[PDB]
Amino acid sequence: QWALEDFEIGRPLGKGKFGNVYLAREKQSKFILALKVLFKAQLEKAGVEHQLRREVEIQSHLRHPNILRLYGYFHDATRVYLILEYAPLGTVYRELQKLSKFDEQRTATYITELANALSYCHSKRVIHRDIKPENLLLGSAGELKIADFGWSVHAPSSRGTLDYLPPEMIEGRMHDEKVDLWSLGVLCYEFLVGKPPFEANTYQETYKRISRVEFTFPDFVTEGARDLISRLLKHNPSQRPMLREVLEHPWITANSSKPS
């Protein structure tokens, strides 16, 4: 159906490991969108065909305002093209670099939107497994949108930076929905502080800090945020709260600008 000739390509939006993402306009409708370009040789050498199929399959059937739409795909002799919803306000990653850290209200609002999207996913027993700032995008009204479903699967299951991964996943053990709850805790901390809680200089040390759950709070982190973050970052996945508990947490309801 679709081919390259149906699109006018514009400025580069961002780069990933495989993805090279461009602004584009569909010629006949003038529909503005983002084109994620992937190199077949690279996908082949890495052997990640199965991940790309999951990305296309999962994300094209999901329908939630806080989840980035994927409309379709095509391919030519050297490349694959994913047709995505364009997110005009950029990444949460960029916004964090701009401001250093977020206040409590901005943080709590992002966490609610995230918890809302993750709740929809887990209801279908879909787990994302790669929640982090560069994969969280912003809409025209500044609303958060989860993207990059390359690592997602159907729980239960086995299998760059370790910073967002829970102990059971890094230790090669088995995992479920609770992995996304650990990542949610890591994100809440990084939003308020400016860096992720287990960050270190080497892969080897980061691994040690994650598996031992070694993190501390700066003085300016309030009691409420401390309580929520400490509940999310439990070694034992079953001890981690449910998304409903997160959305009803006193610190969240006191500071968030959006509902569940």
Binding site for ATP: what residues are annotated?
Answer: 17, 36, 85-87, 134-135, 148
Contacts to ligand JSB from residues 1-40, by CB under 6 A: 40
Residue 84: exposure state from Cβ atoms within 10 A (0-12, 13-18, ≥19) = buried
Binding Mg ion (rule: CB under 5 A), the pick from 104, 113, 148, 190 is: 148
Q: How far apart are CA 159 and CA 181, in angstroms?
A: 18
Q: Is-catalytic flag, 130?
A: yes
Looking at beta carbons only, is 49 or 103 nearer to ligand JSB? Answer: 49
Omega cis (within 30) before 156: yes
Q: Which of 160, 162, 155 is closest to 178 using CA atoms?
A: 155
Which range in 8-16, 100-108, 206-214, 230-238 contacts ligand ADP by CB under 6 A? 8-16
Contacts to Mg ion from residues 118-137, by CB under 5 A: 135
Looking at beta carbons only, is 147 or 193 nearer to ligand ADP? Answer: 147
Contacts to ligand JSB from residues 53-112, by CB under 6 A: 53, 56, 73, 75, 80
Total number of residues that touch Mg ion (CB under 5 A): 4
Q: How far apart are CA 144 and CA 65, in angstroms?
A: 9
Instruction: In angstroms, give the least distance from the CB of 84 to ligand JSB.
Output: 13
Phi (first) and psi of residue 77, to 5 degrees: -60, -30
Looking at 101-256, list the stretches that DSSP marks H as alpha helix, in order from N- to C-terminal side: 104-123, 167-170, 178-193, 203-211, 223-232, 243-247, 250-255
If you compute the radius of gyration of the chain from its CA atoms, what whole number of angstroms results? 19
Binding ligand JSB (rule: CB under 6 A), the pick from 49, 171, 214, 227 is: 49
User: Per the residue annotation, which of 6, 76, 103, 130 is the catalytic one?
Assistant: 130
Contacts to ligand ADP from residues 216-255, by CB under 6 A: none
Which range in 42-50, 127-135, 146-154, 202-210 contacts ligand JSB by CB under 6 A? 42-50
When CB distances are held under 5 to 8 angstroms depending on the partner's kind, the choice from ligand JSB, Mg ion, ligand ADP, none that residue 36 binds is: ligand ADP
Q: How far apart are CA 85 and CA 69, in angstroms?
A: 5
Separation in Å, CA 6 to CA 29, 31, 33, 62, 258: 10, 11, 12, 25, 39
What's the token pair of residue 26? 């569909």
Rule CB under 5 A: say whether 150 interacts with Mg ion. yes
Looking at beta carbons only, is 131 or 210 nearer to Mg ion? Answer: 131
Which range in 59-67, 99-107, 115-123, 144-152 contacts ligand ADP by CB under 6 A? 144-152
Q: How far apart are CA 131 and CA 127, in angstroms?
A: 10
Q: Which residues are catalytic?
A: 130
